[PDB]
Ligand binder design. Structure first.
Ligand SMILES: [Mg+2]
Ligand SMILES: [Mg+2]
Ligand SMILES: [Mg+2]
Ligand SMILES: [Mg+2]
Ligand SMILES: [Mg+2]
Ligand SMILES: [Mg+2]
Ligand SMILES: [Mg+2]
Ligand SMILES: [Mg+2]
Ligand SMILES: [Mg+2]
Ligand SMILES: [Mg+2]
Ligand SMILES: [Mg+2]
Lengths: 191, 211, 75, 52
RNA sequence: GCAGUCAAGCGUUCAUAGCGACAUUGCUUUUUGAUUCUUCGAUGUCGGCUCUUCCUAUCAUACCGAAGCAGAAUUCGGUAAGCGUUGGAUUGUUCACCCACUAAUAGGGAACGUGAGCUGGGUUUAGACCGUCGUGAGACAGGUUAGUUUUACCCUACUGAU
C-alpha cells in the first residue's frame, strides 16, 4: 500500500563511534574498525543524541521496508563485532580414518590443510580470510576455533571448511564423516 | 471405444433423444442418482449444499459416474454413510453420434456412441442435504467431484431448508402450527382452497388454536 | 512364448505373481550335473496391432459380396 | 565411533531435512514451500527418509 | 506419438522411493486417415552408397538431487546437444530379426535431405512361363524370368586464384 514513513532504532553502546557519509558506515571500537557500503539500499540515517541512531524509509513499499530492518541488523553486528567479537567452534566426526588438519604457509597467504579425509590422497586446502584468526582447541579433542571482528568472514571461513569435506558416491545418512560447526558465539564473556 | 471428452464438449447439434426413429442406443453409465440415507425425514437434514455449473456445456454419462463415486466415497469414510442424502439432479438423455466406418464422405451418417447431459449456466448438478455441524465434509466431498468434470463449477451453501422450496425461518413459521405434514421423502403443506371435508381428514393439528 | 524368447535345455518353467496393471512379468527357470534356478523379468510395452488401427480408417472390411434379386417376393 | 552428540551434530546437516516432491530438492525441516522457481514454489513437500 | 492432473490396485506395517488402471486438460506433425488449394504445353516417382548441417523429446560422456542408496551393482529426476553412437549373417527392402565388439550401439528434421552425384536389386511399357478366373479377346495391386538412366560452356552460390 506504500507506508507514509517507517523507522527503526539502532542503539549504540558507550564505547564505539559510528561514522556515516553517503552510505559508507564506519564503526571504530575497541577490537578494531569495520566499514560497509550501503549505497545499494536507499535509506536515511539520522542521529538524535550519540547513543541512539534512527534509520528511516519514506513512502516505502513492502519490500523496501523489509530491507530497512536488515540494514539495522548489519549495522548492529559491526557494533557487537568491534566490541565483543565473533567466535565459531567446529568439531571433526569420524569412525575409521582420523582427519588431520594443519595451518600451512604458501606465498604468505595461510591455508587450512585437511589431510586424510575418509582415506583420500587429495590434499584439501582452504585459504584463511583477512582478519579471521584460526586456532586448534587444546583439551577438547578434534575441535577447532575461528575468531575475529566480522561475522561475514568467520562464518564463511567456517562454511568453506564445512563444504570442503563432502562425501561423493556414498550414503551420507551412513557416512557421516566431516568437520561441522558446533557452536557460534562471541569472543568476550558476560554479553 | 471411447473418444476424448474434448470432442463432444459443446452443445452444437439438436436434442437427439431415444425414440422410434433412433431406436438403438447404448445403456447409460450412471444408473442410480440418489445416495446416502434416502429414507430420511425432512426435519433430520436441514443444511443444503449444491454443486452449480458455471458453463453451458455437455457432461458425459461417465463424467458423472466417476464424480458420483468419489463424492460418496469421501463422505462415507469421514462422516459416516448415514449422515447425508446426495442427489444427482442431471439425467443423461442426449445421444452422441460417431462416424465409425464406398469412399470417405460418399455416404456419411454416424452410428450412436453414448449418452450425455446438456448443462446450463447456474444449473444444479449435485444436491446434498445434511446436519448443521456436518458442513466441512460436504464442501470437501464435492471438491473432488469437481476435478472429474470439465469447465467451471462452484459450490454454494443454500438458504433454503433441505430440499424444500422454503427458507430457514419461513419453514419454522409454518411447521410450528399444523400447516405442514410429512409426505414420505418430501413434504405436504396446507391449502386454503379445495374441499373443506378432506382438508380436515388430513392435517389434524390445524383447526384448534391451543397446541 | 516368453521362455521361447529368452536369447542348457531346462528342467522346469513356472512364473511368479506381478500385479494386474504393473507393466511387468517375472518368471523362473530351472536348468549335465549342476541344477540352477534363476529368475528373469520382462518389461511389457504397449502399441497398436494394425487391424485395430484399420478400424479407425473407414475402409475396414476389405472385401464385399453384394447379393441381389429383382423380385418383390423372394422365395 | 558414532558418538551420541557427534551423530546428532552431523545428522543436523545431512538427515534432518525435507524434500520437494516435484523437483527432489533438499529443504529445511519446517518449510512450507520449495525455494526453487522451476517447480512453482510448490507446497507438496515430504520429510527425508531415515536410515533403518 | 509425447506430457501433465486425480490416484484404483501394488509396493510384508505403510497412497505419493518406485510400478502404476481408468478418467479429466494439452502439445506434436517422425504414423495413418479426411479434404482437393497449387502442378496434367511433365517439379524424375523405393531403397542403398556418399556428405554437410540443424532439433532435443539425452543412449553414452561432465557436475549434481532423490531412493524401500551399508558396499558393489542399480532405479528415478535436474543443468547440458560440447563430444560420440560401430563390424557382420538373411531380405531389393524401409521395417524386422539374429551374431559380435563397445564408453554408447538414443530418437528425429532439412521438397518423406540428396538420380545434369552414382547405382538400378525393387516398382511401372513392349518378349516369355505357371496358377486361378473368363466361351473368347483377355484380367490378376498373385508367383517367376529378360529388359536404352541424355545435356553445363550461362547467372548465382561454394572453393581456390589475379
Ligand atoms: Mg484442385
Ligand atoms: Mg513449363
Ligand atoms: Mg528439379
Ligand atoms: Mg534440454
Ligand atoms: Mg554390408
Ligand atoms: Mg525424397
Ligand atoms: Mg540434385
Ligand atoms: Mg539420372
Ligand atoms: Mg513385360
Ligand atoms: Mg478354361
Ligand atoms: Mg530389373
Amino acid at each position: 500500500m506504500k507506508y507514509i514513513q517507517t523507522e527503526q532504532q539502532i542503539e549504540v553502546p558507550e564505547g564505539v563511534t559510528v561514522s556515516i557519509k553517503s552510505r559508507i558506515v564506519k564503526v571504530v571500537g575497541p577490537r578494531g574498525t569495520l566499514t560497509k557500503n550501503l549505497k545499494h539500499i536507499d535509506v536515511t540515517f539520522t542521529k538524535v543524541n550519540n547513543q541512539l541512531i534512527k534509520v528511516a524509509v519514506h513512502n516505502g513499499g513492502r519490500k523496501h521496508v523489509a530491507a530497512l530492518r536488515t540494514v539495522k541488523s548489519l549495522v548492529d553486528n559491526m557494533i557487537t563485532g568491534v566490541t565483543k567479537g565473533y567466535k565459531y567452534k567446529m568439531r571433526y566426526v569420524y569412525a575409521h580414518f582420523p582427519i588431520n588438519v594443519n595451518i600451512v604457509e604458501k606465498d604468505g597467504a595461510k591455508f587450512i590443510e585437511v589431510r586424510n579425509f575418509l582415506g583420500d590422497k587429495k590434499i584439501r586446502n582452504v585459504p584463511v580470510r583477512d582478519g579471521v584468526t584460526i586456532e586448534f582447541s587444546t583439551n577438547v579433542k578434534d575441535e577447532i576455533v575461528l575468531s575475529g571482528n566480522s561475522v561475514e568472514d568467520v562464518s564463511q571461513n567456517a562454511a568453506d571448511l564445512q563444504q570442503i569435506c563432502r562425501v561423493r558416491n556414498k550414503d551420507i545418512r551412513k557416512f557421516l564423516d566431516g568437520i561441522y560447526v558446533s557452536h557460534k558465539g562471541f569472543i568476550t564473556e558476560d554479553l | 471405444a471411447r473418444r476424448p471428452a474434448r470432442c463432444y464438449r459443446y452443445q452444437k447439434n439438436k436434442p437427439y433423444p431415444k425414440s422410434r426413429y433412433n431406436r438403438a442406443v447404448p445403456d447409460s453409465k450412471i444408473r442410480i442418482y440418489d445416495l446416502g440415507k434416502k429414507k430420511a425425514t425432512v426435519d433430520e437434514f436441514p443444511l443444503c449444499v449444491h454443486l452449480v455449473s458455471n458453463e453451458l456445456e455437455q457432461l458425459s454419462s461417465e463424467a458423472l459416474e466417476a464424480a458420483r463415486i468419489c463424492a460418496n466415497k469421501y463422505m462415507t469414510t469421514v462422516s459416516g454413510r448415514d449422515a447425508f442424502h446426495l442427489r444427482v439432479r442431471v439425467h443423461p438423455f442426449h445421444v452422441l453420434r460417431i462416424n465409425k466406418m464406398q469412399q470417405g464422405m460418399r455416404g456419411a451418417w454416424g452410428k450412436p456412441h453414448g449418452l450425455a447431459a446438456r448443462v446450463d449456466i447456474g444449473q444444479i448438478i449435485f444436491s446434498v442435504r445434511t446436519k448443521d455441524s456436518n458442513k466441512d465434509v460436504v464442501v470437501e466431498g464435492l471438491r473432488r467431484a469437481r476435478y472429474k468434470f470439465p469447465g467451471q463449477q462452484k459450490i454454494i451453501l443454500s438458504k433454503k431448508w433441505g430440499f424444500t422450496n422454503l427458507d430457514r425461518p419461513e419453514y419454522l413459521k409454518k411447521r410450528e402450527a399444523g400447516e405442514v405434514k410429512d409426505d414420505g421423502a418430501f413434504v405436504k403443506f396446507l391449502s386454503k382452497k379445495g374441499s373443506l371435508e378432506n382438508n380436515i381428514r388430513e392435517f389434524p393439528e390445524y383447526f384448534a388454536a391451543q397446541a | 512364448a516368453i521362455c521361447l524368447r529368452r536369447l542348457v535345455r531346462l528342467v522346469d518353467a513356472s512364473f511368479i505373481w506381478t500385479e494386474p496393471h504393473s507393466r511387468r512379468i517375472r518368471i523362473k527357470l530351472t536348468v549335465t550335473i549342476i541344477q540352477q534356478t534363476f529368475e528373469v523379468e520382462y518389461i511389457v510395452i504397449a502399441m497398436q496391432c494394425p487391424d485395430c488401427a484399420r478400424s479407425y480408417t473407414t475402409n475396414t472390411w476389405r472385401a464385399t459380396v453384394q447379393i441381389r434379386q429383382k423380385v418383390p417376393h423372394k422365395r | 565411533i558414532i558418538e551420541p552428540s557427534l551423530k546428532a551434530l552431523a545428522s543436523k546437516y545431512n538427515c534432518d531435512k525435507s524434500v520437494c516432491r516435484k523437483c527432489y530438492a533438499r529443504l529445511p525441516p519446517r518449510a512450507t514451500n520449495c525455494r526453487k522457481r522451476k517447480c512453482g514454489h510448490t507446497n507438496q513437500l515430504r520429510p527425508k527418509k531415515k536410515l533403518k
